[PDB]
Ligand binder design. Structure first.
Ligand SMILES: CCCCNc1ncc2c(-c3ccc(CN4CCN(C)CC4)cc3)cn([C@H]3CC[C@H](O)CC3)c2n1
Ligand SMILES: [Cl-]
Ligand SMILES: [Cl-]
Ligand SMILES: [Cl-]
Ligand SMILES: [Cl-]
Length: 270
């Protein structure tokens, strides 16, 4: 049963606080913190992990959502290893998300660093397209199980040690024309965000819509303007990203269609 499944997943997602030690802060904000940790595994050895730290309703909501996310199982979707709920000395709940430690970090920062001499080398065309195919694959998986991401952007995609990209962390310039209008939000809204993310990748990390301010965005799109084609981006790659921003959501391709379009393009390169 539907209740049965949710109880199982809840059982599976929680981690004994004993099995975890927290280390240095890697990052910090109004969101909360990201810290390094070690997780003791069933096999007796420890794993390096990343720990993201953030009413009983709100806690149960977190747990239920965490339960669903742990259940995703795809190479291009980040594996949620589990959650711990600690409490502050003020008696405020401190929910912790346990994720793999990814030494190459988020895709956005990686693109920026490739433009510096000490960072990764210049990233060729083929590899930038590969990153897009990986993200599409992860998004194809999620939409096929009716999950909406809602914050898809290059900063929320992670690079794994083998250079595979996975979608993670489930921002006016990423938001589709109709979710600006109606606050209405489908998987075709995620498709819109994916096209923007593809543009971030093809520009090696530019902010979308240079020259245009966040308050101007809705009116800019309302008059039919879209992101411009990046320099040295194939015409056919641009066509694909432009399809993501078609005014009417039903005209946008699905992630499945996009993904095959991107794989074909990639296949065709020397
Ligand atoms: C879904 C969020 C968690 C996903 N996992 C994860 N794992 C790791 C990191 C690091 C990070 C990794 C390594 C180092 C030191 N060396 C750097 C050079 N390298 C070759 C060896 C290691 C420093 C920071 C930053 N982040 C942040 C990305 C941006 C996110 O917004 C917030 C976490 C990380 N996130
Ligand atoms: Cl600890
Ligand atoms: Cl992963
Ligand atoms: Cl830039
Ligand atoms: Cl632009």
């Amino acid at each position: 049963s539907h209740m049965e499944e949710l109880q199982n997943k809840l059982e599976d997602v929680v981690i004994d606080r004993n099995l975890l030690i927290l280390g240095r802060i890697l990052g910090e904000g109004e969101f909360g913190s990201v810290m390094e940790g070690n997780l003791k595994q069933e096999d007796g050895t420890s794993l390096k992990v990343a720990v993201k730290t953030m009413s009983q309703r709100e806690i149960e909501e977190f747990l239920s959502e965490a339960a669903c996310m742990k259940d995703f199982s795809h190479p291009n979707v980040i594996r949620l290893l589990g959650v711990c709920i600690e409490m502050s000395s003020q008696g405020i709940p401190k929910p912790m998300v346990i994720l793999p430690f990814m030494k190459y970090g988020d895709l956005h920062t990686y693109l920026l660093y490739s433009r510096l001499e000490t960072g990764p080398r210049h990233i060729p065309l083929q590899t930038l397209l590969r990153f897009m195919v990986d993200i599409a694959l992860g998004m194809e998986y999620l939409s096929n199980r009716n999950f909406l991401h809602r914050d898809l952007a290059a900063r929320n995609c992670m690079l794994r040690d083998d250079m595979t990209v996975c979608v993670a962390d489930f921002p006016v310039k990423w938001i589709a024309i109709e979710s600006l209008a109606d606050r209405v939000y489908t998987s075709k809204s995620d498709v819109w965000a994916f096209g923007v993310t593809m543009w971030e990748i093809a520009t090696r990390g530019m902010t979308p819509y240079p020259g245009v301010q966040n308050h101007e965005m809705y009116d800019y799109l309302l008059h039919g303007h879209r992101l411009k084609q990046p320099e040295d981006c194939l015409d056919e790659l641009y066509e694909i990203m432009y399809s993501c921003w078609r005014t009417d959501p039903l005209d946008r391709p699905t992630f499945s269609v996009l993904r095959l379009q991107l794989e074909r393009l990639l296949e065709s390169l020397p």
